[PDB]
Ligand binder design. Structure first.
Ligand SMILES: CC(=O)N[C@@H]1CCc2ccc(Oc3cnc4[nH]cc(C(=O)N[C@@H](C)C5CC5)c4n3)cc21
Length: 276
């Protein structure tokens, strides 16, 4: 099952690109009569040595994760390719923009709860995502979302609860916490910072004009990394989204606490979301 033969993976269409590589919709059909299962196949076409090493790490991390709110690993094909389950409604960013009129606050709260449970589990496995955002969240159906794109994901060292990355910025800066911007320090607490921005994204329906980049860029005014750092250290944050519940906005601000240890854990965030 885990060893997918390359000749049986029949290409259908393109899906998109994560942090590195690209993903394709394929039908794995060994019987050769297109009666097989649709799957999501990731590969690296135009990639350096650094991205190849990250990909080997992504495969092993995702293979080991088992949650209802984390995209399932199916197997591998060797030209190394990662086979994942296919979620036909796509990513949440586009889903919220497309179906803005139909999706009320209670539904946004359900996605927040499911993502939080996924991240709580990811914390128990001592794994840091490093790129938690609406673009990397997939949609199974109207009542079910999963976390995806584990390319930048790291396991914490056996003796520490934080990871210092040597590389600078493989993702957009507007989801990073202060200690990641200033010192490249990543942890479960920096993932909680990013969850606050995801909460902001949900409750703006990923509207482009009031996105994290759009809002912060106006504050930064006429180095982009250093200016963002200054704003965050001075106490500047994303505003309350229009028509956002007050209780949800207070949780965002707790997720954006200056010190990592003052941010709540995903285990403490879970009940607070579910009781609204
Ligand atoms: C043709 C089209 O409408 N494409 C849109 C563009 C954006 C997007 C994303 C996912 C997506 O659908 C799916 C569906 N199942 C999937 N399984 C793994 C996926 C994945 O890794 N997607 C990345 C590109 C992604 C997690 C980082 C994955 N992506 C579809 C689209």
């Amino acid at each position: 099952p885990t060893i997918f033969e390359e000749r049986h993976l029949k290409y259908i269409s393109q899906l998109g690109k994560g942090n590195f590589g690209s993903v394709e919709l394929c039908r794995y059909d060994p019987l050769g009569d297109n009666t097989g299962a649709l799957v999501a196949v990731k590969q690296l076409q135009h990639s350096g040595p650094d991205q190849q090493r990250d990909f080997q790490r992504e495969i092993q991390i995702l293979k080991a994760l088992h949650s209802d709110f984390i995209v399932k690993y199916r197997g591998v094909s060797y030209s190394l390719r990662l086979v994942m389950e296919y979620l036909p409604s796509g990513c949440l960013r586009d889903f919220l923009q497309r179906h803005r009129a139909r999706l009320d606050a209670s539904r946004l709260l359900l996605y927040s709860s499911q993502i939080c449970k996924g991240m709580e589990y990811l914390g128990s496995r001592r794994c840091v995502h490093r790129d938690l955002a609406a673009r990397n969240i997939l949609v199974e159906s109207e009542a079910h979302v999963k976390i995806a794109d584990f390319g930048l994901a790291k396991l914490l060292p056996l003796d520490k609860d934080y990871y210092v990355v040597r590389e600078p910025g493989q993702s957009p800066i507007f989801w990073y916490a202060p200690e990641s911007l200033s010192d490249n320090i990543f942890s479960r607490q920096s993932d909680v910072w990013s969850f606050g921005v995801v909460l902001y994204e949900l409750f703006t329906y990923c509207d482009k004009s009031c996105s994290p980049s759009a809002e912060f860029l106006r504050m930064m005014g006429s180095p982009a990394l250093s200016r963002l750092l200054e704003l965050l250290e001075e106490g500047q944050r994303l505003p309350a989204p229009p028509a956002c519940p007050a209780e949800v906005h207070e949780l965002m601000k707790l997720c954006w606490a200056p010190s990592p240890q003052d941010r709540p854990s995903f285990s403490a965030l879970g009940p607070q979301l579910d009781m609204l």
